[PDB]
Write an enzyme that holds these catalytic residues in place. Sequence first.
Site, PDB file in Angstrom:
ATOM      1  N   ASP A 150      16.869  22.893  60.825  1.00  0.00           N
ATOM      2  CA  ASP A 150      15.853  23.939  60.939  1.00  0.00           C
ATOM      3  C   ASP A 150      14.823  23.561  61.989  1.00  0.00           C
ATOM      4  O   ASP A 150      13.629  23.577  61.739  1.00  0.00           O
ATOM      5  CB  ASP A 150      15.181  24.237  59.590  1.00  0.00           C
ATOM      6  CG  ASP A 150      14.425  25.579  59.572  1.00  0.00           C
ATOM      7  OD1 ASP A 150      14.469  26.369  60.553  1.00  0.00           O
ATOM      8  OD2 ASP A 150      13.743  25.938  58.586  1.00  0.00           O
ATOM      9  N   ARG A 154       7.593  26.150  64.002  1.00  0.00           N
ATOM     10  CA  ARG A 154       6.834  26.056  62.751  1.00  0.00           C
ATOM     11  C   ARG A 154       7.046  24.712  62.062  1.00  0.00           C
ATOM     12  O   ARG A 154       6.222  24.303  61.233  1.00  0.00           O
ATOM     13  CB  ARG A 154       7.261  27.207  61.814  1.00  0.00           C
ATOM     14  CG  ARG A 154       6.497  27.332  60.504  1.00  0.00           C
ATOM     15  CD  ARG A 154       5.023  27.658  60.640  1.00  0.00           C
ATOM     16  NE  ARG A 154       4.292  27.565  59.362  1.00  0.00           N
ATOM     17  CZ  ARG A 154       3.953  26.422  58.751  1.00  0.00           C
ATOM     18  NH1 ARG A 154       4.309  25.244  59.248  1.00  0.00           N
ATOM     19  NH2 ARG A 154       3.260  26.461  57.614  1.00  0.00           N
ATOM     20  N   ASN A 155       8.148  24.038  62.400  1.00  0.00           N
ATOM     21  CA  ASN A 155       8.528  22.748  61.839  1.00  0.00           C
ATOM     22  C   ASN A 155       8.215  21.530  62.723  1.00  0.00           C
ATOM     23  O   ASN A 155       8.726  20.437  62.486  1.00  0.00           O
ATOM     24  CB  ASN A 155      10.007  22.792  61.486  1.00  0.00           C
ATOM     25  CG  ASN A 155      10.268  23.714  60.338  1.00  0.00           C
ATOM     26  OD1 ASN A 155       9.379  23.907  59.491  1.00  0.00           O
ATOM     27  ND2 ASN A 155      11.462  24.321  60.301  1.00  0.00           N
ATOM     28  N   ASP A 168       9.330  18.437  59.012  1.00  0.00           N
ATOM     29  CA  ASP A 168      10.224  19.182  58.123  1.00  0.00           C
ATOM     30  C   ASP A 168      11.617  18.553  58.024  1.00  0.00           C
ATOM     31  O   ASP A 168      12.651  19.223  58.105  1.00  0.00           O
ATOM     32  CB  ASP A 168      10.326  20.641  58.576  1.00  0.00           C
ATOM     33  CG  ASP A 168      11.014  21.511  57.551  1.00  0.00           C
ATOM     34  OD1 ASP A 168      11.959  22.238  57.925  1.00  0.00           O
ATOM     35  OD2 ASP A 168      10.702  21.502  56.345  1.00  0.00           O
TER      36      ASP A 168
END
Length: 287
Positions: A150, A154-155, A168
């Site tokens: 992922d 955002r990570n 993450d």
Amino acid sequence: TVHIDLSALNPELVQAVQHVVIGPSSLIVHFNEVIGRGHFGCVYHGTLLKIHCAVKSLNRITDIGEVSQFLTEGIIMKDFSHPNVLSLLGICLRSEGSPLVVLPYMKHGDLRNFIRNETHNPTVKDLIGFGLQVAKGMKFLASKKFVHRDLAARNCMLDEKFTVKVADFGLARDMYLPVKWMALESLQTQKFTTKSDVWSFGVLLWELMTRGAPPYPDITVYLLQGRRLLQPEYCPDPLYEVMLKCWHPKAEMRPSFSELVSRISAIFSTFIGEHYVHVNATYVNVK
């Protein structure tokens, strides 16, 4: 309501994880200063003896096998040490299986919200620089045979020095399918590889140059019509060329993260911080 006695842990594992364990006298969790909470547990500001940290409080683990998996992941993650990868400062495991994961505090939060924020004034050079840092962190992770699954803006986190940390993963998961970042073959087979991380990395570069627009502002059908993300307004042509290489229909023909670090280092080096990047009017507020 389940009781767990942690003395049932295998003594060899307990000894093996000692270097990762933070003692209670070394850590102050600031319980009234919450960074975030939800189904994952809770994240608080912390002080580690002083250094400012984020402390993730996990849900209670009441099975010794699950505790052992947690400790083992801690040992492995401790050695994932790289300037562009979020580090594990340590763990605590208190009475009744109440775990804490201690991570460095990230002043500027996640990279997506950072670039989206209108009070920030990034240049093309800055944004490419962020992408280069992510490529360096991923070059490292790939060298450990680690597949992220992922990778997305955002990570990734941003510290006080504007250093990007790929986050993450490992015990830093669940601190808050990603089909719009997935490679075609992953959409089709549910299998992830470093080459599908490279696809995701291309989408992350697109997120950077758009200042955090949602990708494709139904995805397998859409891609198979013969489509890719459009070149961002402020994206240099050579960087769009790199994005297209990241999305090569043949996984084996995609560049390695090593090649990406090389290529993006060169593109980055040509800029001097003159070109300010702004959001596309048709992408603003799109979810």
